[PDB]
Amino acid sequence: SELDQLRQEAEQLKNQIRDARKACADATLSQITNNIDPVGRIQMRTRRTLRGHLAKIYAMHWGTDSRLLVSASQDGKLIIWDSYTTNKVHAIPLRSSWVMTCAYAPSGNYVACGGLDNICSIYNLKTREGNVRVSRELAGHTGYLSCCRFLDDNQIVTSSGDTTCALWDIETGQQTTTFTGHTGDVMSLSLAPDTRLFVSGACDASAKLWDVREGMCRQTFTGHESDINAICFFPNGNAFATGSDDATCRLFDLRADQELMTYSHDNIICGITSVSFSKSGRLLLAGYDDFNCNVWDALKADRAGVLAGHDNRVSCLGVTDDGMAVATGSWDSFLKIWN
Amino acid sequence: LSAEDKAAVERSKMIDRNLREDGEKAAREVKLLLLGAGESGKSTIVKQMKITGIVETHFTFKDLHFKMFDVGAQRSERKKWIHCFEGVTAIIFCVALSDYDLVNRMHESMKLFDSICNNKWFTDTSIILFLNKKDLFEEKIKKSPLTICYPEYAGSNTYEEAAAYIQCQFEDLNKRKDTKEIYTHFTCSTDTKNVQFVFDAVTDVIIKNNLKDCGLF
């Protein structure tokens, strides 16, 4: 009827939610994880360095085989890198050079790409012609593309620069399901291991758990006080990390929907661009704006190690499904593999 | 050692050569960024260049390729995609001089100019200011005074004085006076002049960049 009642009802509901959260919060994860020995210092060496990009790199993804990875840069080129041999498997010339996101299909047959253009272009790699073409153009969005991650050979979940997230069908090329819960720009996107739920981060300093099939979100977390810049699901699938310009990493679980730990320090004052877990999830790796990368313990909140091989902002960070190595991309136009 | 991977290495070398050629071509190409409020003014500016998302325009002048990127239609928070324009040779800012009589619009344009000028990402890139609607501005000045949106304004009600005051107000917003230069200009109906001024500004900024690369600047 009027805001004077609906807003008050929403405020009372938020009050109830916060009261329930406080009641459920009995013991923090920090003091319950003191019984396990610290991981200790971790030293990682740059076994392989990939060069050939001539512009700032913004996103990269690891394939299912944990050997081939796709990288995107502002020069308008996608390079399929053979990490084992540093070979250039493919070079896709992008129609629009304004690209800041990319993805690799689980089957390895298609690779997604997008950016300031409103299209999450899909390219076919295993075609008989031997050349890479555009399988389809998904131009159903309004704002700038932020991240679209493959769900299957025919389904892809897309997050754009507007307040709405959408699910696309490759064969049909139409909006299968659109999510409008977010009230601000959407930046980060990650998928659960079971490919049934996904969490999208937005500039409203909140993260929402969305249902792929249901269509409506089930949880909302507002722990952060700044725009949500990065997000990644925990391997177990019951929790997910988060990076933000606040310069801290917050771990939220799906079941208790609390804020478990905050990874922060006085030295770090800049934002976090990308975050991802290891195979076991014990080590949390986050990319920072300064010329280095940091490894955070998922249970102790200690600086396990520093990866200072880059000289510019780190824009992406991915860990293989196998987990034998970690690839760190930055604005140096180079990709470095650490393990 | 390798038996079949040698062909893959040769293919990678060919791809690297193609990438190097494309990068050289891109470096030869000059990048320009278009910013400002009002679709009509930006449309007029782009149409004055003689040969959805971002609209990209390609044109050549004096054997120099020019790339112009349109971001007005993006309709997104600038704080998350303005860093992609780090390597832009120059930024063109277009404002309608008649916006002062429409609803406050001049204040919004000034705020946008201040935000862009003081952005950490554009601490070195030059900004070119294009003052649109010269005849319309003169008619509005002869009809309505400029003091409506400029309480501090105190001077003769003349087109030249009002234009000078507007230019001075726009320039003072540049905090990085030493590091950044503003090539303000007044748009004219006749063609071949706005493009000439853009080319001159690009030549000046390219000279600055070359001197800095050498070490003198």
């Epitope: 053979d82 012609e129 031997g130 | 038996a3 293919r11």
Partner: single-chain antibody, 233 residues
Amino acid sequence: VQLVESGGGLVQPGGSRKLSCSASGFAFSSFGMHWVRQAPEKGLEWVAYISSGSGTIYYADTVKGRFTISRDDPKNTLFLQMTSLRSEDTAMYYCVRSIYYYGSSPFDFWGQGTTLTVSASADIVMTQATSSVPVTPGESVSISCRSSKSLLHSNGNTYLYWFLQRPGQSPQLLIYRMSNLASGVPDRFSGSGSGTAFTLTISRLEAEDVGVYYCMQHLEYPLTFGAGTKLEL
């Protein structure tokens, strides 16, 4: 995808002919090319190869120097200039496409080929166990072969390929690296090996599987073929 070849006919001994092939439906520039000849009674034999970048041109020991191969990328055609032909040079030549990258399927497509009649060591051999095996529809048959040198490279990839040549048509690739099936190959086909002995199993035999089965080795470049096992229905 088509590969039309021309330049056959009766050739006097000691003469020179310019074989030409036209490539359409695929990126000729990005794909390497191989030339394979078939004796009237014997199996196929590799002749020459040219890479995508027109480099690393390799020849068989029996045509080294005598034969030269060139390609025209803008023209989208392949050429094979052969000079000083001898009596044994007569054979049915084929044009073969190939690409090389992780997960690639070289020798996937074979040209139809044209007839060519002439008026009258240190290589890996493929010792095929059997030359003819009797088969019936709905049965399972096993084809085995032996290689002088183990094809298991240090990278863990075994360089073995299988080809099916139905009568009246060019051969087609069946399995590459004895662990992956080419496009259009029915899933019933399966192959396995221990790095030195290879066995090919064809379960649920069908009428269209009749023909003769050939093998490959790709560790050393002087590629050699197998004797060939004939399947009679």
